[PDB]
Amino acid sequence: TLTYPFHDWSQELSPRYAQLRASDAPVCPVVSEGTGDPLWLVTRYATAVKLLEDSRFSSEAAQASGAPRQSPVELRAPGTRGDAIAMLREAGLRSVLADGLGPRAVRRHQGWINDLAETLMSELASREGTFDLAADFVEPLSSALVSRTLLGELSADERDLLAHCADTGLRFCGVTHEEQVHAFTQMHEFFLEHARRLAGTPGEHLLKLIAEAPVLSDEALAEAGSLLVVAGFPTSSGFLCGALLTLLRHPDAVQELHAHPERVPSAVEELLRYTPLSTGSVKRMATEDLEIDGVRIKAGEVVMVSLEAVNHDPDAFEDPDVFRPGREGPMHFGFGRGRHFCPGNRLARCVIEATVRAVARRPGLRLAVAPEEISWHEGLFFRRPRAIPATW
Numbered sequence: 001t002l003t004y005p006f007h008d009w010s011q012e013l014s015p016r017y018a019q020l021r022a023s024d025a026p027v028c029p030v031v032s033e034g035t036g037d038p039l040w041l042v043t044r045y046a047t048a049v050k051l052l053e054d055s056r057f058s059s060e061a062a063q064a065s066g067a068p069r070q071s072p073v074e075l076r077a078p079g080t081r082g083d084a085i086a087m088l089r090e091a092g093l094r095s096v097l098a099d100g101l102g103p104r105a106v107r108r109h110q111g112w113i114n115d116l117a118e119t120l121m122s123e124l125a126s127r128e129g130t131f132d133l134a135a136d137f138v139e140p141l142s143s144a145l146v147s148r149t150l151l152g153e154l155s156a157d158e159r160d161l162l163a164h165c166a167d168t169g170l171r172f173c174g175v176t177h178e179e180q181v182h183a184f185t186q187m188h189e190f191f192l193e194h195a196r197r198l199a200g201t202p203g204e205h206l207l208k209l210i211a212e213a214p215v216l217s218d219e220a221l222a223e224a225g226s227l228l229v230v231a232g233f234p235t236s237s238g239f240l241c242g243a244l245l246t247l248l249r250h251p252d253a254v255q256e257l258h259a260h261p262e263r264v265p266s267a268v269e270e271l272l273r274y275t276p277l278s279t280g281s282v283k284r285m286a287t288e289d290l291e292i293d294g295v296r297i298k299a300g301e302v303v304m305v306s307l308e309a310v311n312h313d314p315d316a317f318e319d320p321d322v323f324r325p326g327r328e329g330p331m332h333f334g335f336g337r338g339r340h341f342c343p344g345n346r347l348a349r350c351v352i353e354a355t356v357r358a359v360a361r362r363p364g365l366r367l368a369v370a371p372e373e374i375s376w377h378e379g380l381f382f383r384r385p386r387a388i389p390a391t392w
C-alpha cells in the first residue's frame with residue numbers, strides 16, 4: 001500500500017524510514033509511484049549489509065529491459081545499452097579506471113582542487129554582504145571536478161547543457177516522461193558528437209584515459225561520458241551543497257575542526273553518513289529465488305536499499321540523527337557497499353575534504369536565512385537546494 005519514494009526533497013528525511021526500520025520484517029514491500037511496479041525496500045543496516053554483499057542480488061540485471069524500477073522512466077538514452085560501468089570493466093578498463101579515479105588521480109588533482117576551493121572562499125570573503133554558496137562555490141567547484149578529472153575541457157554552455165540534462169533526467173517527478181527521456185537523448189547525442197574531442201583536450205581526465213585504452217568506438221565513448229555525468233555531476237554538487245548546509249548548522253563542530261585540522265577526515269566521513277543525498281534507493285535484482293533475513297525474494301524481484309535510512313539506523317549508530325565527527329560506529333553507506341562501492345569515492349572525498357577545510361579555516365561562515373527558509377529542488381534523485389544564502 002506504501003508508494004515510493006517518500007517525497008522528502010529537503011534534508012528532513014521521511015518519517016517512513018524510521019517506520020519501516022521499526023517494523024517486523026527486514027524487507028518491506030512498496031509500490032513505485034512512477035510505474036506501479038512492486039518493489040522491496042530495505043531500511044536496516046544489518047539487512048542492507050547482507051543484501052549488498054550477496055552478489056546473487058545483481059545490479060546490472062536490475063536494469064535489463066522489463067525490470068521493476070522506482071524511476072518513472074528508463075535511465076538511458078533510448079537505443080543504447082546502459083550499465084556503462086559494466087561495459088567498461090568488461091572491456092578490460094579496470095586498471096584504467098584505477099588511474100583515472102584512484103590514488104594516482106587524487107595525487108594529480110588534489111593540488112588544484114584545494115587551490116580552487118580556497119580561491120572561491122577567498123573571493124567570497126572579500127565581498128561585503130551575503131552570497132550564494134551553491135552558485136558561487138559548489139557549482140564552479142563541482143563543474144571544475146567534472147571537467148578537469150572526468151570529461152575534459154568544457155565550455156560554460158556545454159557545462160550548462162549537461163547540468164540541465166542531469167537535473168531533467170534524474171528525477172522522480174516534475175518533468176513529463178518524454179522531457180525526462182529527452183534529457184538522456186540530448187546527453188547521448190552531445191557525447192556522440194563531442195566525446196572524441198573532449199577526450200583529446202589537455203590534462204589527465206578519465207575520458208581521455210578511456211579513449212587511449214587498448215582493448216573504443218564513439219558510441220562506447222558517448223556512453224562513458226553520459227555515465228560520468230550522471231554518476232559524478234549531480235552527486236558531487238548535491239552532496240557538497242548539503243555538506244555545506246550541515247557545516248553551517250554546526251558551528252561548534254566547525255570551531256573544533258578550525259582548532260584541530262587533523263580531525264577533518266573523520267569529519268568528512270561523518271558528513272557522508274549524516275548528510276542525505278539520494279531520495280531513492282540503490283537497487284538490485286534477485287538472480288534466483290533467495291532468502292533475506294527469512295524473507296523469500298523471488299527471481300526477478302527487485303530489492304532497494306535506502307542508504308539514507310541505513311546511515312540513520314540507531315541499531316548501527318548511537319544517536320544516529322546527531323552530527324558527531326570522530327564518532328566510532330560501523331562504516332557508513334554514503335558510498336554504498338560491496339562490489340559496487342562508488343569508484344568515485346576518492347575524488348569525491350578529495351573535493352569534500354577541500355571544502356571542509358576551506359570552511360574550517362574561516363569560522364563565522366553562517367546562513368543568511370533560516371534553515372527552514374532554504375528552497376529545495378523538488379523531485380530530484382539527488383537533493384540540491386536552489387540556493388544557499390550565506391555570509392560572514
Ligand code: HEM
Pocket residue numbers: 059085150228231232233235236239277282283307333334335336337339340341342343344345347348
Ligand atoms: C567524481 C565523482 C563520482 C564519480 C566519477 C562516481 C562514479 C560512480 C560510478 C561509476 C558508480 C557505479 C559503480 C557500480 O555500479 O559498479 C558509482 C556508484 C555509487 N556512487 Fe559514485 N561517483 C562519484 C561521486 C559520488 C558521490 C559524491 C557520492 C555520494 C553519495 C557517490 C555515491 C555513490 C553510491 C552510493 C554508489 C552505489 C550505487 C549502487 O550501489 O547501486 N558517488 N559512482
Ligand SMILES: O=C1N[C@@H](Cc2c[nH]c3cccc(F)c23)C(=O)N2CCC[C@@H]12
Pocket residue numbers: 070071235277278279280281282283307334381382
Ligand atoms: O535516486 C537514485 N539513487 C541511485 C543509487 C544511489 C543511492 N544513493 C546514491 C548516492 C550517490 C549515487 C547513487 F547512484 C546513489 C539509483 O540507483 N537511482 C535509480 C533510480 C533512482 C536513483
